């Protein structure tokens, strides 16, 4: 259910999928399944991302602080969950400062 989306999750993944669903015209959530496909998918995106930083020496480890105040930085970059502008902006920002092909 979409109530199960609203209850057993956090609203930071729900509302960021509220904006992400308001893209194609299914705004009162009459799908209720692609509303449920992506909220499951976006919770993977945060659990693959958070509680991992980038050190000064370059080693991979975990830190149990979790309080940046925009002073610490993450290791995996959140691209899904951004808009079609902000996705291709970050996609092209990698390919211009690196030698990577464009996807």
């Amino acid at each position: 259910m979409e109530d199960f989306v609203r209850q057993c999750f956090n609203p930071m993944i729900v509302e960021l999928a509220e904006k992400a669903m308001k893209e194609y015209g299914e705004d009162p959530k009459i799908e209720t399944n692609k509303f449920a496909a992506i909220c499951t998918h976006l919770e993977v995106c945060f659990m693959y991302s958070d509680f991992h930083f980038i050190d000064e020496r370059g080693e991979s480890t975990i830190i149990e602080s979790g309080d940046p105040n925009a002073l610490l930085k993450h290791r995996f970059e959140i691209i899904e969950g951004r808009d079609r502008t902000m996705a291709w902006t970050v996609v092209n920002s990698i390919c211009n400062t690196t030698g990577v092909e464009k996807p």
Partner: protein, 754 residues
Amino acid sequence: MDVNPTLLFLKVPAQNAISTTFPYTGDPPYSHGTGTGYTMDTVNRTHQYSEKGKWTTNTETGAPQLNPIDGPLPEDNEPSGYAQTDCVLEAMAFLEKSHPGIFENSCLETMEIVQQTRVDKLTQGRQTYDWTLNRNQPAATALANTIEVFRSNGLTANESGRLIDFLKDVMESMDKGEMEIITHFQRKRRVRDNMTKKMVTQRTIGKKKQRLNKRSYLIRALTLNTMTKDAERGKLKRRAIATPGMQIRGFVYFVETLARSICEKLEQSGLPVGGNEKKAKLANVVRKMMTNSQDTELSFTITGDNTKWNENQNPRMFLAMITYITRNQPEWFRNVLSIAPIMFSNKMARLGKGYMFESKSMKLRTQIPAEMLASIDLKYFNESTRKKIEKIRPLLIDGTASLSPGMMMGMFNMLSTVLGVSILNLGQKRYTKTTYWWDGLQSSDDFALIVNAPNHEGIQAGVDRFYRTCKLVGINMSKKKSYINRTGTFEFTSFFYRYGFVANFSMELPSFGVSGINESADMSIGVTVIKNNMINNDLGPATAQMALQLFIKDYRYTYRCHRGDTQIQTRRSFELKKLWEQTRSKAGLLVSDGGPNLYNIRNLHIPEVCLKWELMDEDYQGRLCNPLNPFVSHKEIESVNNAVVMPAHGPAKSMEYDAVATTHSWIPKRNRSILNTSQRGILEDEQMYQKCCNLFEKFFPSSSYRRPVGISSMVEAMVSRARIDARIDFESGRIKKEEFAEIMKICSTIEELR
């Protein structure tokens, strides 16, 4: 001796000297007071020529509207909007049988124009009618007021950038009764001063709530504002031009998208293009009628015109057309084109301003609104206007007037032309099955017809067959202003035709001069107008270096910038001579600050400063090469090299002009009468925001070149860029990575403000 110039038509043929009979030199007629007397003399005239349809009464509107088509047939030569649905469909079921597969082909681009268009396509155009303030707001502020109505309503559902969900919720806006709109009213405050110990006032704007109904929103959703057609030429009277509402043009853009796409695949509508393709199409069919030119045919042309062309339409047979020209199309597509002929067939024109009354005893004037016309002591009016109210006092609903029959100006063309050419399709010989056959063209309302038949009896039997065909669909040709004669002599939107060679003399020359947009960019468009009209509107060589010679003479009067070699005086003459005696390039100095006139008819296409560049000594253009430019305010792509200069063929046309960025391309003054309105609060809130919206648009490079379409929340929108500004500067850069931590610190500090 007695001198008249209209006798030189005794030697010159009339279509060769027809430009003398265009008084386009004097002022055009303006309407002075209102269009209230002009709207009611059109709601009367529509419901007179359609007076026999069944008078229904709309369920959600209360409108006592008329339902006039497929009614009783007309039985006189007076015009009549009684269109036959089994002949509207029938006469364009023959549109596909001549040009095969038009309709489902032309929908397929329209099914792709619908699948890539933003809301930004409808924020450009004329001034529209918002429903929030009941006033002609221009096309940006009316759109950008109705959208946050939905945001101040419960259901937005529109913010996805495309307009189809914006065209989903305007249907859905007709469901929510409580439409809690925003009202702002002006108040005063009381502050102190510490330096002079004085206590003065201060102006500010308050806020007020307001609600609507479903018999109050739906009227305002289906409301057409009625102006007067200012500066029309060729009519002693005036007419109402209709300004469509805000919700309507969203559906109407798709309807004229399709309907223009039909006419570019057809070959008798000169309207989807400008005038030069019209001269091709005109002289095409005078030769197309010499295809079957036998040993003895007779080919009379008709210099037609249609009288009362706008009242005798009906958007109910527009719905009959766009239900048929979207055969076997998808359900959503046939639906979305169908809303616009629906909400023209329930449309409700306002009645303009009202009337200004005059005391011949107390020496007082006053004016009522147009809404009080439901309840007025009727002896306030003279004998003409009193007749006009009583015939539509049953039609006043909520200060509007229920006008379901008929269209009117400024609303929509190019689909009634599709109708009007489809009757001209029917004269193709495969469809007549008789000796007479016709073809021609169809503009907005001025048509031209060429019919042929082996004797006068056939043409007489061919002309009226056409006329009684156009009567079946509400096309009523002007028996006053039309005539017949043989081939080679007619006109068509004043494109006169003499044996083969057109004289244009239509949209003659309302401008040829300083149409001040800037100081350079009305010279760069100034010498472009003489350039373009040597091609399009056909002025010859000597009048091109007269219309240049005199263009400068009032280029130098509005902008005071005469030569130094003229010793005449204005606000500056002296320091101009500093440019004269110091620059060795005397005769290459620019003319927007007192220069020679190097232009002629070899070099109009060259811009001004790029003409005068391979002569100047380094100081002057180096003083012009400063890219700082406090006199430019580097524009946007829709406004870079665009001036809205009106022809007489359409309501507006933007045409470009090779204008180099220079210090003379400045933006003129904003009008300041909005400061004294009670509508001050639409400015003092919003004047601060394009001070700072363009502070964001520094931080995107392509935002001043392309429309930025991403997430909402402009404050959240740049900080998503700022942290991808962060890492590509962190991984590699010239700046220190400790100053990076300063760039980090600002991000949550924004979010510390909730």
